[PDB]
Amino acid sequence: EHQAIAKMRTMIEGFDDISHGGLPIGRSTLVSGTSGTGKTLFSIQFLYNGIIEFDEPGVFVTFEETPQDIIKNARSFGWDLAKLVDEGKLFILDASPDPEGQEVVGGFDLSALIERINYAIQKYRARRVSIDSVTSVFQQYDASSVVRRELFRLVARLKQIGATTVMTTERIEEYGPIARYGVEEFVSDNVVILRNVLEGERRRRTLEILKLRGTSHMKGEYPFTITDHGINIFPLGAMRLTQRSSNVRVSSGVVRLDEMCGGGFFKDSIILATGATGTGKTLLVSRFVENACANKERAILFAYEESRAQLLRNAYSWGMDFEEMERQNLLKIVCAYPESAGLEDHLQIIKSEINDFKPARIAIDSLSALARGVSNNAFRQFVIGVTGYAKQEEITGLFTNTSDQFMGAHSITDSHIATITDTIILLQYVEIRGEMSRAINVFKMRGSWHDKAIREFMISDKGPDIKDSFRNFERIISGSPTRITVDEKSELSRIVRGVQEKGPES
Template identity: 40%
Template structure:
């Protein structure tokens, strides 16, 4: 069966050696698909670094996820102890054993019980292993920790020869095996030099304590015939088993979005070309203490949740309840979003884990919660658990990861000195897409907040300083007054505003006076026009009177003449008394 499997894998992956997935989060990414199929691999490390757990998870995942039964040969812990130890991780070894998916064989060796009386071999072990493999059709085998043989048996020459034979035999069997080994002193990876025999794949686990904070790390020392990650990768053991962080994508080939995300502060959006941040971008808000960084962060989170999207808030300074209460005072109801499941707080002291562990924890949580936005408040505190360069390296990886997932991230950072430096302490300002700076403006006996955008990649943004005010109703940005006296904020700005208002009133007053005068002038003129009009009318009448009189005279004369003519022609119709007429005619 195993052989068929190998063939299948070989045909599917042409150039690479066939690999078996371990099922351990992240490990398969680093190894480029798992550990070599049908060959033994060595997992070594100091006591308590997670060798047994890693190998056991390999077996359990194989049995549960890949339908590959496994044999776990324990040289250290009894089956019962193992079952109890990993029960907290949700691995039910008893059930797997019942289902014939797993076989745990505890090998007990006690030197005091054994006397060596000459030549011997380890056939007993071979027989047991062979029986175990055949009884469940195992494809995976773990020997944990085979070095214990060296403690029980003294004849090194025999042991070494037998181990060599054992690994050869395992290869022939076609099972994928993990051998664990205790880290030796000096340069050797294992105490008994197991790496001599198992040379295809060697994974080194490490557990380091720096500044009282422990970090687990994993490194692939060697992987014959395969490309693999060579870095030290942090890993974490928690309730879901082991997670290794396959850090950085070294290439910068992430997808980008031109979609915008509102910052939750309309005035800020306006400064950012009117629409806010880019989706999947990274935003840094830095400033001195008490400048309202958390308020900006919370405002952003609130806005994301208002849009019915999920937001994950990592708080390194305040507890969730404290943040919710504080934000309530500026009329932001975060509780509602928490109850709706849109907002999740993850509050922890930075000193809880090492940096890498933080990163792993964040990774896990982000993968689980799948938020559209992440807030880290503040990143400054991480310095307490690592050096600047380490924090930067960690944040690079986080930003990389978030960009890949198209998650918008907002960091806040505390700048310790009031002098604005061109770099934040974490040195991340060059990594982020947008950088908002909130700074104190001390003037006129008061402290006000000024905000400006140091940079915002790929969008038109305002170059102005805005005054950043926090009121009962929320956050707002106001234009500061730039005058001959410099930048005016706070009450000085208010005074200036008042001053301007007074001026305005005075001006309007003056204007209305002028208006009235114009009106009056108009009236005077109109009166004048009226009198002139009447004058003109009377003159016109005078002229007309002459015309009429003349007309009358003309007509009367005409009539008289006609009368005269009639009289001259006949006088037949003349009445008796003509004295008057005669008299006239004579004249």
């Protein structure tokens, strides 16, 4: 690899990419951040993996937290650090002050600590080191001058020793100065900021690598999530554009539509179904999921508008029994509120269920449901996510977008996502004779040829009935069309008088 600084891997879902490899060996990385941001876990997680993946003993210095707790807490992610502090792979080095302490002790002890840590590192033969909360040490009676010299000593000596170290720093403001003494930022070789920005009463955490002296890396923020498995990052921008494409074709669950799409949706293709409220989108999606299970393949449905129960009531009324679908273990309905978390999370909940079930199809009813509150870019970037994941995974996607203005919407995007999408399906009302009739249309298909009519469709207990086109109507799209006739009575089946039979017999 073309870099001149040797790196070691953190094995932290995401980091090693953003850091183009992992922390520079024989160096100190300052992972700083607000209260509760993720800091100390990173640290612990950093020593952990080294142990359980490279068999590299690690030395963890605690400053504020009690050596007991660090183990007690780290059990949340499912790690028996105890057992490691026990097998001689992880040496927790207490330095926490005492409940009956004096006052004054942070200079000669800073000299003693070096030798300290230097003992355990030589003793346990360690490669990785964590120094959690150095800050607290200066929080006794210090100022900028004495902090840069004192830190420096520690890192300077540490580097000489050959240990790949991580220090943690607290900071009051999320975007302002990196660290408290606004001095740690230049004493370290690397600087890993961790934030947890608020905005819209929700909470968004992000990781950013300001600098990595010696090599390159991904710049700016990247969202991460602390799950039962610890830190989890999304290089939404490291998501290269090299997915696979195939001319394979699958069903839509709606026959006539299939034709309308050159012969059935492409396996590898994103599908968009936009249409004013009450046009039908939800249905089709259900008919898409259904069929996927009627061919014996898995598929998920993430409902953000309707309940799991109701999704079935209206689903059954349209025929297709979801009750069974669930039972045969072929269709899985998630179903939740977009307000019950930030996108980062929602994007991961979805990803998860896509790995504990391995669908071969997926449908997200109302992307626009997720665009609530959130900023366009934030939402657009999330769309690229799901869309991204499903694309490189051969998993057919059908997204649902509901335009905020029925009849008269000059744009079926509203959030402008129609260019990331491969194939769009359009549903819109049509005002014909004091009646709200429906009508579907196939706008685009990147690989197919698809029908160019704006056919009308009707909903029955049976489903989507794709009838005929409003040829003799102008200003269609306008919603309330204009009837201009050159014909209509034209053949097709003239023959007047008695043409029908009735219910008795024909």
